Amino acid sequence: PQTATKHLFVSGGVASSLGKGLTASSLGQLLTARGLHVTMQKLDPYLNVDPGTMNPFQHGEVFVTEDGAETDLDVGHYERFLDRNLPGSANVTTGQVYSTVIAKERRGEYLGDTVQVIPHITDEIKRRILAMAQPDADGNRPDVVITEIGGTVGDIESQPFLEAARQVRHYLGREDVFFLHVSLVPYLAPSGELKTKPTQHSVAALRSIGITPDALILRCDRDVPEALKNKIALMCDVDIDGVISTPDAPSIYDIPKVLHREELDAFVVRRLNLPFRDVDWTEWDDLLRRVHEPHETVRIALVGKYVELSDAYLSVAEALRAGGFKHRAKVEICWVASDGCETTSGAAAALGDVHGVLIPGGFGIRGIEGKIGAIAYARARGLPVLGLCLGLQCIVIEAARSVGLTNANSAEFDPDTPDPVIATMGGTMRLGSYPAVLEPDSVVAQAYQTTQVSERHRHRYEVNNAYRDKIAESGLRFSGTSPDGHLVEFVEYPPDRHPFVVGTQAHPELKSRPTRPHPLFVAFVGAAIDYKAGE
Amino acid sequence: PQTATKHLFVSGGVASSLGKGLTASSLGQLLTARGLHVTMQKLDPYLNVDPGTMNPFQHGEVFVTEDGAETDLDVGHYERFLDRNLPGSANVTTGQVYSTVIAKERRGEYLGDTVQVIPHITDEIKRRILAMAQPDADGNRPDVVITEIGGTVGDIESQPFLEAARQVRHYLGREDVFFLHVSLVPYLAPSGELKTKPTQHSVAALRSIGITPDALILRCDRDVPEALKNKIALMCDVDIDGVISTPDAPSIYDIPKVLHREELDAFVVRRLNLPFRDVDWTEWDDLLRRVHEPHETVRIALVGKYVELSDAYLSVAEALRAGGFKHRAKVEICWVASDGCETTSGAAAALGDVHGVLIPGGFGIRGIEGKIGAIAYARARGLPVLGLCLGLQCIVIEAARSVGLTNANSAEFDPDTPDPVIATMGGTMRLGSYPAVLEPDSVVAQAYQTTQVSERHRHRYEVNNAYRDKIAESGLRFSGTSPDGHLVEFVEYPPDRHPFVVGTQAHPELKSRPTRPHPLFVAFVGAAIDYKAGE
Amino acid sequence: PQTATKHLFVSGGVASSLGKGLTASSLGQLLTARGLHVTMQKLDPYLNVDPGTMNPFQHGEVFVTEDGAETDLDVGHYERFLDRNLPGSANVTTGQVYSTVIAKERRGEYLGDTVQVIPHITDEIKRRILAMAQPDADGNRPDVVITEIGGTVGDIESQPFLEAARQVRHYLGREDVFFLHVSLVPYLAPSGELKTKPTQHSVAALRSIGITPDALILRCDRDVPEALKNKIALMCDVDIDGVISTPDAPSIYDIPKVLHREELDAFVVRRLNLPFRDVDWTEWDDLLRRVHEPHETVRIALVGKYVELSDAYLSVAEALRAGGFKHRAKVEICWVASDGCETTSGAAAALGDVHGVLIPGGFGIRGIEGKIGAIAYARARGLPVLGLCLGLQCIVIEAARSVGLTNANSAEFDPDTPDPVIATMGGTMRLGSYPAVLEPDSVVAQAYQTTQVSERHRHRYEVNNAYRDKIAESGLRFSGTSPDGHLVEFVEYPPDRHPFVVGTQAHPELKSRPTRPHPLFVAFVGAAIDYKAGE
Ligand SMILES: O=c1ccn([C@@H]2O[C@H](COP(=O)(O)OP(=O)(O)OP(=O)(O)O)[C@@H](O)[C@H]2O)c(=O)[nH]1
Ligand SMILES: O=c1ccn([C@@H]2O[C@H](COP(=O)(O)OP(=O)(O)OP(=O)(O)O)[C@@H](O)[C@H]2O)c(=O)[nH]1
Ligand SMILES: O=c1ccn([C@@H]2O[C@H](COP(=O)(O)OP(=O)(O)OP(=O)(O)O)[C@@H](O)[C@H]2O)c(=O)[nH]1
Ligand SMILES: c1ccc(-c2csc(Nc3nc4cc5c(cc4s3)OCO5)n2)nc1
Ligand SMILES: c1ccc(-c2csc(Nc3nc4cc5c(cc4s3)OCO5)n2)nc1
Ligand SMILES: c1ccc(-c2csc(Nc3nc4cc5c(cc4s3)OCO5)n2)nc1
Ligand SMILES: NC(=O)CC[C@H](N)C(=O)O
Ligand SMILES: NC(=O)CC[C@H](N)C(=O)O
Ligand SMILES: NC(=O)CC[C@H](N)C(=O)O
Ligand SMILES: [Mg+2]
Ligand SMILES: [Mg+2]
Ligand SMILES: [Mg+2]
């Protein structure tokens, strides 16, 4: 019979941004390849009940699940490395826990007690952790749950989750629980030395709350010397087999290979006494060939907020690269500002050297006229264009203005527009998976190679059915809809008007994986390659 | 012009139950007698949004304000020592703060930030503290706000409030902020020595969070020797003028005299540079004469949960003593269990030696038949009876059963009763002050010496107007009502049926003060004295 | 009259090696240039009573004072920036403090008390701090004492000194005491962001022991953005005028200019209310011209332990550069291993491209045959050579072997040598300043331009007076001696044998300053320049 389910806790020291979520994802990929069944959880110590209120240009994109949960973006790294649809239960926040305990208290469920952080908050967190280990709807019980604890050890907001993880160690014992601690080793250029003292103080801080790490991951810009690992092992009371050197890798897809070279997964498997097996690399070896040995390069403009990389489009950038991997092409992202495209000369300057334009969606944007300028320029030049949610809305507005409805706009951006071609059907936010039907041999039907699809949604405005007949005077096809046809889901131009100009109301980048590119990103990068070839 | 408003923070170490709320009340009484205007606040670190859910026999009574807030009972010590109606704003809890910040977050008011314990929770607490210093509805600004921080220094739940108090010290400076720290000095009988080490570790804990105490209150069963106070002052870095010895006093009304003997208030006034004046003792000297030199003793049965003192009836016990002070009588409380009175022989055993029976109210009780037995016995013996809220309901039920409605009951305790003489007008809980009119020369009108009164409410059942005519066949008078007569507020028997048997739907014990006894408790203890005299 | 003496405490966070000793030296240079009288102290938390036992290749050179104290090398940065002879009292260690308190205890001086860390150790440290503020032998009282506390805030060994510094703040008050805190801001290359969290946790650690910093020095590889300094100031409760950005400078002599650009000294002068004045830069501007705009470059071989920079020769490297500054020459140090010079072909490989050879001294070396090979090669090539202490001993041994005493050696390295030309006069270690007389118009007399000098000593072997007549058959002159002639202090070859081959038994690099080059290093770098010119 199957063993007891193991719990592995991932924690971080010195600083955030050390990549412990990619560490947890790579350890999940490794343990999955050894034949274990892994499930994953993130704990977020912030008080927002979900990141749907948070600014994505400051705090990164909101990930959306099939069940329509708005989650932290680390759940997207879990999805991309596991290739699994994760539930909304995969993300916990302090705001959810406190709101739940206070609601139970106001209903009288604690039978007249004083309600406290310990036990009642830590009990709610511990319940949410132990719930992950229960059998799924198909009867499968995980072999391990990997739980990543957000923040830094030493943060006031981190303390309840670390106390609950300690209580899980006490309840299940050291045979069923493993603690992995991520820490920074800085280099000082004037004296030319790596400093171990920050890791020592971080492990001392962790020990002061009753947790001893089973392994240390040392984050550094260069390989940590053996003598320094020995000093760390000695001072931190950690097995030298558990002090792992992890210099920064060229891509996130190398991290599994790095962790396997150091034998972290073998250390974990031995320590937890799990059913050992060798890793099979064949598919991740094919991935890394497509990563590191591309046959060609193509440039995609991303018409976003600013001319620099932002986690606001992390999953769009990853989906573009994955769509390139299918062709063995390097997709270089040219981050273009929306506002430089507002003038037609400015558009021709910024969007001039690129081979495709992507118009990304999301909340946290105000004003869209520059994106409509980018679309108009791209259609004039004959570039391929992929518009995601708001990109569809901009394509429909640009079409409406092209048919002479010069003041036509989204009611979200001109409530006084005489022709609200985009309007609420504040309306209702559509969230999560909805089905669609595609017109046969429509461009999107060729991309999916089917007439029936489902995609994840996060929007509250719809294409105005009152304007369809006028918009269609451009030749635009409402080629994909809700199954009743009531809602437009996809728009396309026929192939003889433009080679590929497509918008979708959905967020398909959330369904993409490096091992399984999404069909539209494949077809879009294909049209970009064909443009570069024809130009 | 008036100075800046000072903030004095009261905090506790080693343990709870050290009496820091009575300390804060006595310091408020002293500073008021020197002519300063004092206002008071309590911070409760528990997550209950109010104690209305908490069991009063475990956690003490719920105090009720004029504006109908359910508050912690320490607000009642503030009311009794200040003789001031305090607002609901006088009590803050962690549950209120978190519920408020989470509601603001879900409304988008933090403009896309990550919401954190620091700043946003500590900012909400600091706002609630600094709000106390604003002018009242009559334009009066307090000279000092005294803020008592609940829990013990070292509790996880205490940390946000202590951090906010530190931020107030940083914002206003040491000239406007004073920290008072209450601590325990234990005596060890085998070695015969007082131990200073617990206070040293408590002050070290306080210093580790950035607060240095301005004075230490040492709680002990015996007077602390001068050499020990010197050792404490030396080790704790506290001015020897600020190490105060406070042995346990015979009554809570002695604590002001004790604190003045040690010159704590003079130390505070000097340190804060407040307008000095002498205390006038004349009224508190008259109080302490009525406390310590009573002319006679009378026994009042309290028919409560159990035969021992409980904070579930703290304000009823204090109101009974205050009602005795008017007569210069010692009122000795005979705590009687409800259940020993269920049999008539058991009632005659427990309620046999007493001169009056009080039937107290509250939530947290189930079953009332023993209290109805107590009332029936007391009316048979001819004892005086005062029934508070539920005591009125029991008196009305006992009357209904006496007129032959043998199964008549409260629907709260027999939902299947054929004659629900007490019923909901789950109904609506009446809270706070409501007016009443009293029948002229009714017994209650003689007690108040008026026909118009207002009293605080906390109940959701009413006397059934359908049964008034039948209940009145006992001779019961509905002598006090709501101003329309729709609701019964007071019941009495005429004086020739019984000397004093009164119930009120209100909680008059909340309006009582030691310096200002409530009229009904005066009239009840008077009827008890008259019974002892006649018997 | 002069004000009270101010105490400024320098402390470090996150890691050691952040350069807080050069920070303290540069602040001393700045405050001296504004006309204040500064004196300096270092506290070392290690238990060694002095570093004379510690390995200099692991822990850096031992500095030697005029009074013959063996001290930490930071006292040499104090000497070079102040140009002051510092006492042995300038360095305190835990070993000295504990040895002193335990000796007092064993003598009964604590009158039968229990001896404790607090008070007695912290009292001894506080006494050693406050002693620095007493008038010197000429009656001058310092305006400020700058005290650098070694280690990192969070180290167990640091805690007594930080507690004593807190007690000094409490005793003298915030008007007389300033706390400067040095901290690291790391850069993470994968995400491209500077992290403030390590500084926040470091300041929180400092606050947890009762110290609030008056200013933060942020150590970084790049200039910290204004928004990050604002975040730090906000979270750490530090005045934004006191958050100082200090990227790594090209040389240690730029740090004063960097700290003045940020106005740290003006912030300090204002905060301490010291007599303000402008800095005069004229001499440090001339220094920085000689640093940054040299007219030529010359290569000096250093025949040390290893082919890389070591703090074992920090003051020798600085003395060589200072000796170059006089000529406006860049002296590039070619670090050469002793052992590569053991074969004559290996010597001709390693010492081939250089223009002068320096043979440095010290303890912590075993075996000298490679240095004798280097000297023999250099004399054959005709290179100039400067031998410091052991370098003199090697020159005398090389001479003895050149006159045919093939087995002649130091008894320290061959106790069985038949001809111990270097021997103990374990002998007595000579420490500190001793006088010497120089033969008139000897090469050393031309260098000093005098016949009478004093130099610092740290050695226990002497030139064997029994061998002088034989060694002189080489033509070597014992041109400098003790005043009686009993001890050889300097050896030279006459100018027609070699242009400059000099050894001294002393450590003249300890008397050198960048503003005042030592005469021998001037004459040696001059002979190296002349060789490069003639070759
Ligand atoms: O992965 C996570 C998840 C959540 N959080 C939570 O976000 C909040 C901010 O935590 P930060 O680490 O971001 O602190 P900071 O921004 O102010 O400092 P630096 O960037 O300069 O380094 C904290 O409450 C933390 O618990 C994380 O830090 N990391
Ligand atoms: O059994 C022992 C042995 C040794 N010591 C050592 O004696 C020193 C004094 O430790 P104390 O416990 O006696 O502190 P204190 O006297 O100042 O406080 P109180 O009596 O009022 O409670 C401390 O350094 C301690 O470590 C003990 O306390 N107990
Ligand atoms: O300037 C000083 C003086 C003295 N010390 C004392 O030396 C001892 C070692 O303190 P370290 O800072 O050197 O710790 P570490 O070597 O083991 O860690 P890393 O180098 O890798 O960063 C500690 O006891 C400290 O108090 C310093 O660290 N710095
Ligand atoms: C956002 C931010 C960064 C990146 C990005 C691109 S490449 C790269 N390199 C990395 N190497 C390691 C190596 C680790 C580790 C984490 C990382 S991250 O934890 C275990 O050892 N990070 N992408 C988007
Ligand atoms: C509930 C619980 C107790 C009592 C009760 C009855 S008598 C008594 N004696 C006391 N003396 C002091 C002296 C203090 C002090 C607090 C107290 S409490 O803080 C400052 O110094 N406590 N009543 C109801
Ligand atoms: C041994 C080790 C290093 C060096 C060396 C050579 S150059 C250089 N650059 C530096 N810049 C700053 C800037 C600071 C500071 C310290 C330093 S050290 O604290 C205040 O701001 N360090 N030499 C011998
Ligand atoms: N996710 C998005 O791109 C949203 C686009 C637009 N604000 C809408 O709600 O329809
Ligand atoms: N406060 C009370 O005594 C409440 C009594 C009764 N449970 C009611 O609600 O009417
Ligand atoms: N300081 C030194 O170079 C010492 C050299 C040699 N060991 C001696 O004592 O004489
Ligand atoms: Mg070290
Ligand atoms: Mg003792
Ligand atoms: Mg941040």
Side-chain angles (χ1 to χ4, degrees), chain A residues 446-457:
Chain A
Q446 294 181 47
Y448 286 101
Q449 302 187 358
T450 177
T451 56
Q452 300 191 354
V453 303
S454 65
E455 292 296 348
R456 306 186 190 169
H457 288 269

PDB file of all heavy atoms in Angstrom, chain A residues 446-457:
ATOM      1  N   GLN A 446      -8.710  26.486 -37.605  1.00  0.00           N
ATOM      2  CA  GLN A 446      -7.464  25.899 -38.086  1.00  0.00           C
ATOM      3  C   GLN A 446      -6.387  25.879 -37.009  1.00  0.00           C
ATOM      4  O   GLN A 446      -5.657  24.892 -36.877  1.00  0.00           O
ATOM      5  CB  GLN A 446      -6.981  26.667 -39.309  1.00  0.00           C
ATOM      6  CG  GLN A 446      -7.908  26.528 -40.502  1.00  0.00           C
ATOM      7  CD  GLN A 446      -7.409  27.268 -41.726  1.00  0.00           C
ATOM      8  OE1 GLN A 446      -6.238  27.165 -42.094  1.00  0.00           O
ATOM      9  NE2 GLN A 446      -8.299  28.016 -42.369  1.00  0.00           N
ATOM     10  N   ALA A 447      -6.288  26.938 -36.203  1.00  0.00           N
ATOM     11  CA  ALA A 447      -5.304  26.937 -35.123  1.00  0.00           C
ATOM     12  C   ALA A 447      -5.577  25.844 -34.100  1.00  0.00           C
ATOM     13  O   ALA A 447      -4.702  25.024 -33.807  1.00  0.00           O
ATOM     14  CB  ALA A 447      -5.277  28.303 -34.444  1.00  0.00           C
ATOM     15  N   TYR A 448      -6.784  25.809 -33.540  1.00  0.00           N
ATOM     16  CA  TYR A 448      -7.132  24.741 -32.611  1.00  0.00           C
ATOM     17  C   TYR A 448      -7.305  23.398 -33.305  1.00  0.00           C
ATOM     18  O   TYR A 448      -7.200  22.358 -32.650  1.00  0.00           O
ATOM     19  CB  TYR A 448      -8.423  25.083 -31.876  1.00  0.00           C
ATOM     20  CG  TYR A 448      -8.307  26.141 -30.814  1.00  0.00           C
ATOM     21  CD1 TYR A 448      -8.710  27.440 -31.055  1.00  0.00           C
ATOM     22  CD2 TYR A 448      -7.831  25.830 -29.554  1.00  0.00           C
ATOM     23  CE1 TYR A 448      -8.632  28.396 -30.081  1.00  0.00           C
ATOM     24  CE2 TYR A 448      -7.752  26.782 -28.574  1.00  0.00           C
ATOM     25  CZ  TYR A 448      -8.154  28.063 -28.843  1.00  0.00           C
ATOM     26  OH  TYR A 448      -8.062  29.024 -27.871  1.00  0.00           O
ATOM     27  N   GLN A 449      -7.558  23.398 -34.610  1.00  0.00           N
ATOM     28  CA  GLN A 449      -7.948  22.192 -35.337  1.00  0.00           C
ATOM     29  C   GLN A 449      -9.197  21.557 -34.729  1.00  0.00           C
ATOM     30  O   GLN A 449      -9.314  20.334 -34.637  1.00  0.00           O
ATOM     31  CB  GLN A 449      -6.800  21.187 -35.403  1.00  0.00           C
ATOM     32  CG  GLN A 449      -5.554  21.737 -36.052  1.00  0.00           C
ATOM     33  CD  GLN A 449      -4.492  20.676 -36.261  1.00  0.00           C
ATOM     34  OE1 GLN A 449      -4.670  19.519 -35.881  1.00  0.00           O
ATOM     35  NE2 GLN A 449      -3.380  21.064 -36.875  1.00  0.00           N
ATOM     36  N   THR A 450     -10.134  22.396 -34.299  1.00  0.00           N
ATOM     37  CA  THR A 450     -11.419  21.926 -33.799  1.00  0.00           C
ATOM     38  C   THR A 450     -12.405  23.083 -33.856  1.00  0.00           C
ATOM     39  O   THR A 450     -12.018  24.248 -33.965  1.00  0.00           O
ATOM     40  CB  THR A 450     -11.319  21.359 -32.378  1.00  0.00           C
ATOM     41  OG1 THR A 450     -12.623  20.982 -31.922  1.00  0.00           O
ATOM     42  CG2 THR A 450     -10.719  22.365 -31.426  1.00  0.00           C
ATOM     43  N   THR A 451     -13.690  22.742 -33.801  1.00  0.00           N
ATOM     44  CA  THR A 451     -14.747  23.733 -33.659  1.00  0.00           C
ATOM     45  C   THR A 451     -15.188  23.985 -32.221  1.00  0.00           C
ATOM     46  O   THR A 451     -16.008  24.882 -32.003  1.00  0.00           O
ATOM     47  CB  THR A 451     -15.966  23.313 -34.485  1.00  0.00           C
ATOM     48  OG1 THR A 451     -16.395  22.007 -34.083  1.00  0.00           O
ATOM     49  CG2 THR A 451     -15.625  23.296 -35.964  1.00  0.00           C
ATOM     50  N   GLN A 452     -14.681  23.243 -31.237  1.00  0.00           N
ATOM     51  CA  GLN A 452     -15.125  23.402 -29.857  1.00  0.00           C
ATOM     52  C   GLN A 452     -13.952  23.473 -28.894  1.00  0.00           C
ATOM     53  O   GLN A 452     -13.096  22.584 -28.882  1.00  0.00           O
ATOM     54  CB  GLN A 452     -16.043  22.246 -29.460  1.00  0.00           C
ATOM     55  CG  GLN A 452     -17.283  22.140 -30.324  1.00  0.00           C
ATOM     56  CD  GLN A 452     -18.294  21.166 -29.768  1.00  0.00           C
ATOM     57  OE1 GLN A 452     -18.034  20.478 -28.780  1.00  0.00           O
ATOM     58  NE2 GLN A 452     -19.460  21.101 -30.399  1.00  0.00           N
ATOM     59  N   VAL A 453     -13.930  24.527 -28.077  1.00  0.00           N
ATOM     60  CA  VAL A 453     -12.805  24.853 -27.213  1.00  0.00           C
ATOM     61  C   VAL A 453     -13.350  25.405 -25.900  1.00  0.00           C
ATOM     62  O   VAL A 453     -14.525  25.759 -25.789  1.00  0.00           O
ATOM     63  CB  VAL A 453     -11.836  25.856 -27.867  1.00  0.00           C
ATOM     64  CG1 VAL A 453     -11.330  25.301 -29.175  1.00  0.00           C
ATOM     65  CG2 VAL A 453     -12.510  27.194 -28.090  1.00  0.00           C
ATOM     66  N   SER A 454     -12.482  25.458 -24.896  1.00  0.00           N
ATOM     67  CA  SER A 454     -12.773  26.158 -23.655  1.00  0.00           C
ATOM     68  C   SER A 454     -11.558  26.955 -23.217  1.00  0.00           C
ATOM     69  O   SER A 454     -10.425  26.493 -23.360  1.00  0.00           O
ATOM     70  CB  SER A 454     -13.167  25.183 -22.545  1.00  0.00           C
ATOM     71  OG  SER A 454     -12.087  24.336 -22.211  1.00  0.00           O
ATOM     72  N   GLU A 455     -11.795  28.149 -22.684  1.00  0.00           N
ATOM     73  CA  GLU A 455     -10.715  29.059 -22.351  1.00  0.00           C
ATOM     74  C   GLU A 455     -11.068  29.782 -21.061  1.00  0.00           C
ATOM     75  O   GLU A 455     -12.237  29.923 -20.709  1.00  0.00           O
ATOM     76  CB  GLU A 455     -10.466  30.069 -23.471  1.00  0.00           C
ATOM     77  CG  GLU A 455      -9.893  29.464 -24.747  1.00  0.00           C
ATOM     78  CD  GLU A 455      -8.525  28.865 -24.558  1.00  0.00           C
ATOM     79  OE1 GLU A 455      -7.907  29.107 -23.503  1.00  0.00           O
ATOM     80  OE2 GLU A 455      -8.081  28.132 -25.463  1.00  0.00           O
ATOM     81  N   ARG A 456     -10.044  30.257 -20.367  1.00  0.00           N
ATOM     82  CA  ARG A 456     -10.212  30.952 -19.100  1.00  0.00           C
ATOM     83  C   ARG A 456     -10.480  32.433 -19.325  1.00  0.00           C
ATOM     84  O   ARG A 456      -9.864  33.065 -20.185  1.00  0.00           O
ATOM     85  CB  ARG A 456      -8.976  30.752 -18.232  1.00  0.00           C
ATOM     86  CG  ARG A 456      -8.647  29.294 -18.052  1.00  0.00           C
ATOM     87  CD  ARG A 456      -7.526  29.083 -17.084  1.00  0.00           C
ATOM     88  NE  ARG A 456      -7.063  27.705 -17.103  1.00  0.00           N
ATOM     89  CZ  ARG A 456      -5.959  27.289 -16.505  1.00  0.00           C
ATOM     90  NH1 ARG A 456      -5.252  28.088 -15.728  1.00  0.00           N
ATOM     91  NH2 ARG A 456      -5.566  26.034 -16.675  1.00  0.00           N
ATOM     92  N   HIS A 457     -11.389  32.985 -18.525  1.00  0.00           N
ATOM     93  CA  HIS A 457     -11.880  34.347 -18.680  1.00  0.00           C
ATOM     94  C   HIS A 457     -11.622  35.186 -17.438  1.00  0.00           C
ATOM     95  O   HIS A 457     -11.583  34.679 -16.315  1.00  0.00           O
ATOM     96  CB  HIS A 457     -13.380  34.349 -18.973  1.00  0.00           C
ATOM     97  CG  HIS A 457     -13.728  33.875 -20.345  1.00  0.00           C
ATOM     98  ND1 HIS A 457     -13.835  34.725 -21.421  1.00  0.00           N
ATOM     99  CD2 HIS A 457     -13.959  32.632 -20.824  1.00  0.00           C
ATOM    100  CE1 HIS A 457     -14.122  34.029 -22.503  1.00  0.00           C
ATOM    101  NE2 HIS A 457     -14.201  32.755 -22.169  1.00  0.00           N
TER     102      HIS A 457
END
